[PDB]
Structure 1
Amino acid sequence: VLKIISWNVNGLRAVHRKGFLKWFMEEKPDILCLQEIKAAPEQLPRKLRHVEGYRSFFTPAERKGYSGVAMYTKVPPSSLREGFGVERFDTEGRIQIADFDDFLLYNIYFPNGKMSEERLKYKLEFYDAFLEDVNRERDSGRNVIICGNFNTAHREIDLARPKENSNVSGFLPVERAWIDKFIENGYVDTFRMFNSDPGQYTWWSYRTRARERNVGWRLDYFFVNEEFKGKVKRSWILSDVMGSDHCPIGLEIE
């Protein structure tokens, strides 16, 4: 069995101060995917950049302290692809696509759309490019695993306050519609393969002590193509892990 963990750290240096490595060796993921590291590798202390036992790959945004994704993996991929072939998406440090023989692993930090009409438009177009990219790789005979911060809660059950948020990027019908669309192309929300209950969240606002009162959303997901779901054994939320406004999620396969 291969354990993969995904975590929108919201600043890899910041989380390093708040027990990152201690936990890292504590959870022992086969693969560790990180989103929103807000760093370039040149900014990271040796023992944070290079964790013993793992190969590490970093893809920072062009812009400083912004976005960025990272992957640590005991067994290296035979290729890491850091983009979809669309410059405006490929320069924000949002994409890592690792080829691990059995599957392709997409580590994606999808755009947040709250800031502006442009940032939602960017978000929705990024969603479109990903779907095409993953569909092309899946239509060609590959199994795919997609993890990361989609920045959208799919259904009213996937957030504490569904009604007040229907007008705000993150729960817009256009955004929820796209997740339906994703699933109808033959992709499975692995968490809801085993768990249909409320109160399962993955992010909470820092403002209003939102986390201790479990007022949050499930914005982080593990998707696999429908041909691959029979290889998934568990999908769970690591709710007790602190450090970010997000908590880790996990997957184990075969």
Structure 2
Amino acid sequence: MLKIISANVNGIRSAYKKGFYEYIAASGADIVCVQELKAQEADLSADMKNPHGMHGHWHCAEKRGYSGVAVYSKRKPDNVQIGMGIEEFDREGRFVRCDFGRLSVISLYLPSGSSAEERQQVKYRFLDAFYPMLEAMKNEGRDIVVCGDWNIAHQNIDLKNWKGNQKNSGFLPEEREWIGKVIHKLGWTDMWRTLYPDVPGYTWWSNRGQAYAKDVGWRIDYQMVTPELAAKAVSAHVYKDEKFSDHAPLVVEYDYA
């Protein structure tokens, strides 16, 4: 029995102030994947590195209060890879991977290109560099969960206002196409959609207007899983009882040992 949680915390410190540290243990989660630390190794409390005695591995940005991802695990990773082998992005702490034997979990924070132009460009280049290793990972012939903030809504059902957002970063045709390829041409399972084909399952809501109240959201947080493990999926839900961030934790349970 295996439970994986993926959460963009929007400031690890903010989240800890909002009750996330307790959630890490109450959830029963065996592995937690976090994005948007907004912190560097120095700013990290010991409780934000080894929560409840879990192991932990992180990759922080070369800028204070920016990006970074981590994975915490009740078990000790017999291997770990920080950064994705190309510095241009590794400078932004955007990719951590952990291998527990046959299993590999990775925390990913794909670049948001909504703020401005060059950001969109970088996002595209990131997709370019990433696709090949998504493929290689697929080919590894093992159980791999790539979870995190993919910053791309796949289809109309994946966001309330699909109509007016077709010209905004996050729902452009190219992005949806990329996702499509990684799911179909590459064979990665979008675990949530595959588990509940009709439920939207938003994971994010803009701070604008009353988006969070009117449930005007996006499903931009994924758990992309390999076929064999995917099939072993049994449950999933978006935890929404407490709010630790402008994202919500996405929890998936697999029958696996």
Aligned residues of 1:241 and 1:248 also touching (Cα < 8 A): no
Q: Please say if residues 49 and 55 of structure 2, whose CA atoms lie closer than 8 Å, have aligned partners that are also in contact.
A: no
Identity over aligned residues, as a percent? Answer: 41
Partner of 2:205: 204
TM (normalized to structure 1)? 0.95
Q: 152-161 or 15-24, which moves further after superposition?
A: 15-24
| CA contact 1:82–1:96 (8 Å) conserved in 2 | yes
In 1: Cα distance, 2:75 partner to 2:128 partner: 30
Q: 3-state DSSP class of the match of 1:105?
A: strand
Paired position in structure 2 for 1:180: 180
Structure 2 unaligned residues grouped into runs of 5+? none
How far has the Cα of 1:79 moved from its partner? 1.6
SS in 2 for 1:165: coil
**8 Å CA contact retained: 2:61, 2:67:** yes
Counterpart AA for 1:187: W
Query: Unpaired segments of 5 or more residues in structure 1?
Result: none
> Structure 1 residues 107-116 or 229-238, which shifts more?
229-238
Offset from partner CA, 1:198-220 (integer Å, 9 cap, x none): 44210001121211110000010
SS class of match (1:39): coil
The answer to whether structure 1 residue 251 and structure 2 residue 252 are counterparts is: yes
1:215 maps to 2:216: yes
Q: Please tell me whether the aligned partners of residues 33 and 106 of structure 2 are also in contact (alpha carbons under 8 angstroms).
A: no
Equivalent residue for 1:189? 190
**Could you tell me how far 1:132 is from its partner in structure 2?**
1.0
Report what 1:138 is aligned to: 138
4+ long deviations beyond 4 Å: none
- Conserved 8 A contact 1:30-1:73: yes
CA-CA distance at 1:225 after TM superposition: 1.8
Residue correspondence of structure 1 range 79-98 to structure 2 within 5 A = 79-98=79-98
Shift of 1:243: 1.7
| Partner Cα distance (1:153, 1:213) in 2 | 19
Q: Secondary structure at the match of 1:148?
A: strand
C-alpha contact 2:200 2:219 (8 A) present in aligned 1: no
How many angstroms apart in 2 are the aligned matches of 1:109 and 1:199? 21
Match of 1:48 in 2: 48
The alignment of Structure 1 onto Structure 2 pairs a total of residues equal to: 254
Residue 233 of structure 2 corresponds to residue 232 of structure 1: yes
What is the TM-score with the length of structure 2 in the denominator? 0.94
Take 1:143 and 1:3, find their aligned partners in 2: how far apart are those partners? 14
**Displacement after TM superposition at 1:102 (Å):** 2.3
